[PDB]
Amino acid sequence: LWEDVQRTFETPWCRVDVLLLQSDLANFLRRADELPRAVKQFEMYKSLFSQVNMLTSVNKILVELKDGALKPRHWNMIFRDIGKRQIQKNLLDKLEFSLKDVMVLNLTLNEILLTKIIERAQKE
Amino acid sequence: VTLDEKMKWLECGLDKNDYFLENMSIVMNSQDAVPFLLDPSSHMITVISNYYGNKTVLLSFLEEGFVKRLENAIRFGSVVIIQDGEFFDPIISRLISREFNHAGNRVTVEIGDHEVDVSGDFKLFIHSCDPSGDIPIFLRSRVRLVHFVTNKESIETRIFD
Amino acid sequence: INLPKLDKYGSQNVVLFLRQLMEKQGFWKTPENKWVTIERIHIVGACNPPTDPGRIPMSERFTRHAAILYLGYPSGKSLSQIYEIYYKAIFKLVPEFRSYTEPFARASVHLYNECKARYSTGLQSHYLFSPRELTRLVRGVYTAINTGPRQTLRSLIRLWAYEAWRIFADRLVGVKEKNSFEQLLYETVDKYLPNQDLGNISSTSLLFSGLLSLDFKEVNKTDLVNFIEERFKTFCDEELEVPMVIHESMVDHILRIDRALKQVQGHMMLIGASRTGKTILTRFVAWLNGLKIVQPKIHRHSNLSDFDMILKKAISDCSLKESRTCLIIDESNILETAFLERMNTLLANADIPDLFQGEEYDKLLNNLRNKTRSLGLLLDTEQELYDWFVGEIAKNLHVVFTICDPTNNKSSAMISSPALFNRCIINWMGDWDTKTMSQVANNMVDVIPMEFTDFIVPEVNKELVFTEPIQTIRDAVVNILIHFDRNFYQKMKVGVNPRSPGYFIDGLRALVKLVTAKYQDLQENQRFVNVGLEKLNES
Amino acid sequence: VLKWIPRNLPSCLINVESSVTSVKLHPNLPIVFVATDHGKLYAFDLFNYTIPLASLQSHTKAITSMDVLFTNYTNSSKKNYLVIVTASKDLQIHVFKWVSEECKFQQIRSLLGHEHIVSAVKIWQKNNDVHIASCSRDQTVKIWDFHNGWSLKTFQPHSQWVRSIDVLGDYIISGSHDTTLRLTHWPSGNGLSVGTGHEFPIEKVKFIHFIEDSPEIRFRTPSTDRYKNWGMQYCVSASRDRTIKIWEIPLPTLMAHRAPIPNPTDSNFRCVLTLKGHLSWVRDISIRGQYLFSCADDKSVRCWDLNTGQCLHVWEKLHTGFVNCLDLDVDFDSNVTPRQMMVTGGLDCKSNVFMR
């Protein structure tokens, strides 16, 4: 499961579909309960379970971030202002940055900034 | 107001008569709502421009740069006179009603999609052609109507003079 | 079938095509010029009676081939039965009053019949009643019972009367018709309900609101007025800043707009006159209920596409984000019949089938799939998703129409529109009465330079005082202002309701400013002469 | 001791010229300070409340909030006194000093840094140093310094105008007009968590401070982990949606010599209890021992129980108008002993007191 979690996270942003992602996290949540209590008491399971909660709870902001109005310039602005880091130009212009890089952005904490940026994205 | 205002009005190009003097008194006295200057003759816009000098900005509803030149003029107190009052666009509707959202250091008005400041000395005037055309009830209500049409139904005053 | 218009020389080509189909059993293919014979295809038409506006009498050469069936409104006794079932279903909630389920239905039907008989289209274009009004009354009674406290029989009767006032008598104009409705309601209660415990039944003494508490119950007038005052101060401080005087009529209009915006699918048109408060009241009431205001903005002549995208954004916010929008459609926001068609088809079922088509339809269905999955309400077929979409739009989008003097051609056209008429709570607020003008002026003349002018209180005949009896200058000045307003409106213009008082408020504001300035000048003159006299005394 | 339900009738009623906006008790003397909607700050003695001891018109506009801190300098060079910091709608934050030996107000500073109306003000002392916080409608929370008067830090926690604020150590929680809470480390201006779930603007926000003399209590005591080291576990926030919600603050990844970093693993508040029963907007909140006292616009005051979550007593029709403020002496602090009084300044130009 943990390998499945990591491979889902490393998936590039251009190849993830919001409905597909939601179904995949539903499958992950279903598979999580089948683990024994001994696995439950060990910390990596708790960490990945919290990651699954992240992906289930940030569904709305992920959907709003998957709208076609957003552009590579807009993602550059998001990563420079909210992430405080710049992605390489070749990887940025292809919108293939890993979903882990989006999770690095707190999303829940910076949801208002994301919403205003996507509002400007729609208005363009 | 005193006779200084009377001679200032007359020297700008107004007629020497009770009707036009009273209408100018109505237009000038207090500005809590925009005035609607209505007269078939176009000589009154020249009078308004002469009163305020070269700071007057001329603008019309029909031309394209309408909103941009509004956002320019209003923020640093340029008196604006609208050429046509018969037509109207409800974009400027926010400005007509005193709906500025005050703050501790500024007052702002919403035009289109821009929160543009207003200097506070800004004056807005509306000029109209012959009263044959109609005006929407919004304009007729909010805006202070005033007739500068050539004398009619009175005649006795001019011949009396 | 009678809707299509005639040609220059009469006759409708579509109706003649239908006559060809019914009589000759076929038609001519226009580009191939060949005769086609239709087999076992039936033609069924549905039309309103020709006396309705917009209906054109068809040629008898067409109606000669069809059996005309008149499916009128159901009887005057079938309604009694149907609403006896409806009231039984309602009173399942309160079985202690099960014995009164029949008199309530009888009184409702008698109310409907009397309203139909008294107020007719010959007086106002918008006096048109149907069993839809009775269904609305039943549903309103159910909503107030369901979200209310433990009802008592007097409370039940008063609630039913309040619902009757909101469904039927809101559309009435003037005061004579409202008094007629009040006496009719008294007569109905006396005739069909032997219980006699109601107090005053008028619209100003039936105040039901879920604002002051968690239950839809009757509220005290003074408590509600104070609550509205302290909420409206906050509204002005936070939202738009225009100072507005609180008066009794505005409280009733606030209650009406509140109960309309709380409906499952509730739209209202405020057909009054300009500078009354129709828009600001809607904004305030939506602010109380937490609805997002969307006011469409157009230029001199905006194409239909701009209105379409405004509607699409509002619909998306209502459904995919449960924003609970309160769309305010002013008359100036409508300038072509396409806008009216879009509004009436939006109010028709719940929404616009047209705004979602093609790629946008695919994106909308994907978003609906993901949203329904997020709420854990998975639906595997397109029909279920579209039904959920329609339900969300119905229970989240409230459209309010702000209409000035209905004598305008566009106002009359949109009032007379069938869909908007039937699907909206028509609320005639009209122009300010003497009491409302008196209250507004009294709260606007509250300035201290109103004093210092010795007032010779006159005998002043009570028949021409309007406001409270005169004991101070404030009464004199308010009476003078209101009397001049009435004289000016009855002299300059001829007609009924040309425009609500907008000159009155400007006159009061200018009066206050001028009095303050002139008295400041007088005070400084008094100070100058007094100090000069004091210095001369010192000399 | 802490468990004290005030009598169903107020002990003494204080009449003021206009509506009361914020009432603050005196930490040592029995003096009630009352602010008004006309900016006139009033000081009232509890035993002699007929005439105010001293009234001072500092702000032209209405006072929006008041906070009171008794200085506790550890050096004998300076003498302890009282600091009264008042916000107002005139973009001013006036700081006074209560001259106990003369019973008069001595203004010290006239802080002004906000670009629009300031709503709430909180003042606290940290190792001979006194700091003043102030959230305003310009969406900015400014951390002032009392001795100097220069804003140590300014940050924007919300895109809509912040209304309430509460400090505890180096962290600020601020409820805003956009119906969200946000815990912010004010020395660095770094956000840590966001609390969503209210459907109307948030009126008042308070931390639930840790208490230990009580045997056991649902919320005031920590939940083991490193929350005890952290110092805070829960927070309570009234809102215009006529409900009071008690949240649990997610615990960030603290690091030595580094400002706390918002934990991506958990960065959302989690509602644990939702008190319902008020008939209108809840205006103010105070916590004493186990009982959560709240005042609302329904002209009533309620005393919820933190453990069960149920209302115990209701002071219905306490005021003829709304109830704008409610004050109780803090009990987590050491120098300030909990003293059994309760004051409810209202909109009816009156300020009930619940002495015993």
Ligand SMILES: Nc1ncnc2c1ncn2[C@@H]1O[C@H](COP(=O)(O)OP(=O)(O)O)[C@@H](O)[C@H]1O
């Ligand atoms: N009760 C009131 N007290 C004071 N002014 C009012 C009142 N009702 C309406 N007004 C005036 O009406 C204007 C707002 O009316 P509004 O509702 O926006 O126009 P409309 O009725 O055409 O939508 C304000 O300028 C205000 O001065």
